């Protein structure tokens, strides 16, 4: 028999170190009706069987499976008519790149894969993408039809106030439970949460569990103090090198700051992963890895909120607001004598102009790159480095040994990269719904800077909606069968993103729209010696906190409206 | 036949009026297995019916009674053995009145009377009290312990914020949510509802109710802003009369601003009724009776809160911290030529004193008073002036025509009592709640003032538990069944009493703990031409602020860790 025409729907790949217990006549004793062929797998230790299970014998050799508690993993692999069906898609999807993606495709996305995880983030972005299209448009007509006073619009801050509130209460009460009970109603079985979760006794006290997470709040303080200490540092380096320094390469001396910044970062999540969030996740005794992981991620999304945002917020909280006070004897009052200039300290008027375009169109073509070319780099490095780098080989001989016809090498080159490629590794609906909320959150506080962000982003949500499309569809590691075998912290932090750029759009512009800072805003020779804003700080924080209670209160009705209907 | 020998169960009064349509006639063919007695009601044109259903014969006759259209009301009366049970239940809650309630106490009444009302009010009230009790003994504790300086108590403060946090959440994700499900497990039927949500098409847009909600907040904030004004009006004419005034008779005329503030808030509230709620929360188009007497009551708190809470707010916050603003040449700078003195204005250092014991002690005995003996003397006054006030006569033909016994004339008594008599009216779950949470707001936010507080309101609700079960258990009107026949904005209000207190209390603490007049809080000749607080205003309302954020946070912790259980 050959694989090609025993079609498989499913892939064990277990492990046969074991020899003396022989795990392979077990895996075919227990397949004593359905046929399946074994084959060696990429490691010396580990071999494929390519199985043609269906809906009747598919509880009892999970349960065995379960039982025999040696299986690596358990791929649903796609069969030649569910493999073309989603290539039809994928080429439909191709086509029409320009238009929105439409929700009859993410119908049948989600009836031929079965995959709630999938089908909930392409939801999403389907439906951010149909939000972003009329906030590009307002924000085309405000950057052209307005002209010069495009910055700090009153007009497009209400926009986005409005459009941030509607847009999160529409998704979390219209749409989102909508796809979670379509994707409830197929519920079906996910090999993942097996050979993961067995000997499922539970009772592990969620009041323990919710009090343990309580404990971790001092330690997420004290790290995201430090890395913002380390912040601050490193910007007042910073503008040390840019403004009040007088060497001769200030040029190459300007990127010290961003290096030092860009090491202790990763240094630093390390240290907290590996002392402090994995032990307490460990002690916090979740019941499923599920669980553990949403702990993981929540823990760890303190830093990445501070490593995005803090800059802006520097820039344009204590950069700006207070640079007429570097300007007198502080700086002779702040030790190796280098050469300082003693002139009058002018702010940078464009900082924050260069930081968001930074933010929301270099940046984002670097995370692009870091998530989809760079891995695919590094492999090719690390094979050209070493051509058999893991020394493993087993290829080509097992090529030779098995005289796979195409197909069958196709398949089984298929199930290698499933368990070998980054690409081929699970989707992971965290990563991609932290990227998309990353996002969300730099348009929805600081695109009152620009308001072609939405446009950008649009554009950029687009091209990713594309790509994300073809890589789950298509080399991502299948998660979910076809037949019954028997968001959470996403949403929080959307809402905390939406009150917070409600807040700091309002704020902003109520700061910068008639400031003293020539080109910032609406239309003196020495306008850096005095206070740039002209509202105090008092009233501004008086403002900030209004506009956030109206914001709870009016994201408060949104969702009571939401809710009824 | 005679009325305690059929010892009835129920007991249906309609109109007779249409005698050509012969009402007795036909309800009495429709009970041709059940055998009743109807005899002439306290009307002349109304008559009682004592029926002894079952549980057989339920369902069928109540259909007929709900198609009959012309029926006053149905009254689930308590037959002898279920009296006997309630008055022993009754004499047992009288013994032992000084010991907290026994929630033994409340499975049993809930038991026998199967209202979800009234034993939702008494788990609240329980509750209440069972925790009332360690906050006075604490509150006893500060006040003699600490002796002096039991004012704006630091400790007394934190264990007050504390308390209300976890009382809250406690009431709310552990209490009611099990009270909810007992009573729920009841669920039985209830006359009320019945021959008042007939004909229940609904589809009545859920959506479009909300946003006619949401088109009141203009009227609510204006009538609240009419209010508020005419308070701040008679509060500075009773500071005008009391103060800078040089009237021979000061002793009487300070009683004008109480009669000033006392006849406007009525009028102020039928107009408000009359004009607005009314005929907004008809055209809300409520389904059901109870979404729109729920409605009516949360459009009418608002003027219950300002009349209830604005006094004291003024003093703690306008009067006292702004008073050396007033001694000033304002008061020369503000027609009658009145005599007025010419001195320094100098605050009344004892008017939150004076004002907060009124409203824990007094404002107490003068609710119960009214709510208890004021309907009861009504109503002897009103016959005492006409014997016969309706000109009823037809009680004592009724008497004379049916020669009814002694039992006979108790039961036609309890059911005229229940039709007639204020206390024999259906029991008011919204009337008794919002009287505990008035009591509940002032102990929350004002009782730094006087520990004592928690003391005199866990008394006040000992004695007022004991009336209301005597009440709402002996007279009442009954509205549930013993067997089948086929709290919402209290819980808002709580939570946002609890912030509120929270925020009040630590405010209040942080301005007159320290504070510069003299036996306010903790230890200059001329200290009332100076500001009497030591912190700004700016520091006053940003740390309110703080304080309010530090309490969301705090509530939410404590709600997760009891939803966990």
């Known amino acids: 028999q050959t694989i090609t025409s025993l079609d498989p729907n499913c892939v064990i790949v277990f492990n046969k170190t074991s020899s003396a217990n022989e795990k392979s006549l077990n895996v075919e004793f227990k397949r004593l009706n359905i046929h399946s062929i074994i084959e060696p797998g990429h490691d010396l230790q580990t071999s494929y069987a390519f199985i043609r299970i269906h809906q009747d014998n598919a509880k009892p050799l999970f349960s065995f499976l379960q039982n025999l508690d040696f299986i690596e993993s358990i791929i649903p692999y796609h069969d030649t ?8 898609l994928i080429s439909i999807s191709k086509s029409k790149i ?4 439409k929700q009859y495709e993410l119908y049948n996305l989600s009836n031929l894969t079965n995959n709630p995880k999938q089908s909930l983030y392409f939801a999403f972005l389907q439906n951010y993408i149909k939000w972003l299209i009329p ?25 986005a106030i409005l459009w941030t509130l509607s847009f999160t209460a529409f998704w979390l009460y219209k749409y989102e439970p909508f796809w979670s009970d379509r994707l409830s109603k197929y519920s ?23 009090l343990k997470k309580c404990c971790f709040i001092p330690v997420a303080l004290l790290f995201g103090a430090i890395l913002l200490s380390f912040q601050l540092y490193c910007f007042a380096l910073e503008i040390f090198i840019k403004q009040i320094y007088n060497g001769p390469m200030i040029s190459i001396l300007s990127f010290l700051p961003t290096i030092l910044i860009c090491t202790f970062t990763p240094v630093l999540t390390v240290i907290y992963n590996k002392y402090f969030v994995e032990p307490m996740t460990k002690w916090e005794n979740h019941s499923s890895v599920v669980n553990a992981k949403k702990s993981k991620e929540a823990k760890n999304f303190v830093i990445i909120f501070l490593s995005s945002y803090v800059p ?9 607001p207070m640079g007429h006070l570097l300007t007198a004897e502080i700086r002779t009052k702040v030790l190796a004598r280098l050469p300082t200039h003693d002139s009058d300290f002018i702010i940078d008027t464009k900082r924050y102009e260069d930081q968001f375009f930074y933010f929301i169109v270099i940046n984002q073509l670097i995370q692009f790159s870091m998530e989809n070319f760079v891995p695919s780099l590094v492999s090719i490095a690390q094979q050209k480095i070493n051509g058999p780098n893991p020394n493993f080989v087993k290829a080509e001989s097992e090529i030779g040994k098995a005289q796979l016809s195409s197909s069958d090498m196709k398949i089984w080159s298929k199930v290698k990269s499933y368990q070998t490629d980054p690409w081929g590794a699970t989707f992971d609906l965290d990563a991609n719904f932290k990227k998309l909320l990353l996002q969300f959150g730099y348009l929805v506080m600081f695109s009152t800077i620009w308001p072609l962000a939405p446009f950008i982003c649009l554009i950029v949500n687009l091209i990713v909606y594309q790509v994300d499309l073809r890589k789950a569809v298509l080399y991502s590691k299948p998660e979910y069968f076809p037949f019954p075998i028997y ?3 996403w949403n ?38 005095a206070n740039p804003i002209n509202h105090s700080w008092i009233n501004i924080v008086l403002y900030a906190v209004f506009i956030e209670h109206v914001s709870v209160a009016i994201f408060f009705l949104f969702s009571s409206i939401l809710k009824s209907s």
């Open 188 to 210: 079906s079985f996910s090999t993942i949460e097996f050979l993961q979760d067995k000997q499922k006794a539970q009772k592990k006290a969620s009041s323990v569990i919710m």
């Open 98 to 101: 320009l238009e929105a993606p």
């Open 312 to 320: 802006l917020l520097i820039t344009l909280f204590l950069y700006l």
């Open 135 to 159: 906030f590009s448009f307002f924000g085309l007509s405000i950057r052209f039809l307005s002209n010069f006073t495009y910055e700090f619009n009153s007009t497009y801050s209400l926009f």
């Open 487 to 489: 968001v959470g912290l």
């Open 492 to 529: 929080s932090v959307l809402v905390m993103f939406s009150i917070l750029g409600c807040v700091i759009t309002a704020t902003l512009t109520y700061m910068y729209q008639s400031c003293n800072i020539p080109g910032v805003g609406a239309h003196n020779k020495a306008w850096y010696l």
């Open 81 to 88: 008519e569910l493999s073309d069906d989603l290539h039809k």
